[PDB]
């Protein structure tokens, strides 16, 4: 977030399949629709994967 809210805006890339926070960007990648529009089942599965 410090990279993104920055002048110039830093491009960033996330790798998948490893584990932990990168994968909860991956679930914030393929099921996202129009940017940050995230539904309730996916936010709750995300919450329990942070809790696990």
């Amino acid at each position: 977030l410090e990279y993104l809210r920055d002048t110039p805006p830093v491009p960033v890339v996330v790798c998948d399949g490893s584990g932990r926070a990168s994968d909860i960007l991956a679930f914030g990648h393929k099921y996202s629709e129009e940017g940050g529009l995230i539904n309730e089942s996916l936010r709750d599965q995300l919450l329990v994967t942070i809790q696990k």
Binding site: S41, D44, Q45
Partner: peptide, 30 residues
Amino acid sequence: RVENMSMRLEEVNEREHSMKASLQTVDIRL
């Protein structure tokens, strides 16, 4: 038939992804 292996086990893999989401939700539901 290795071509056929690759595509059919691809179907098995994505189907199991749906099954994982369903069973984790069911475990949350119990």
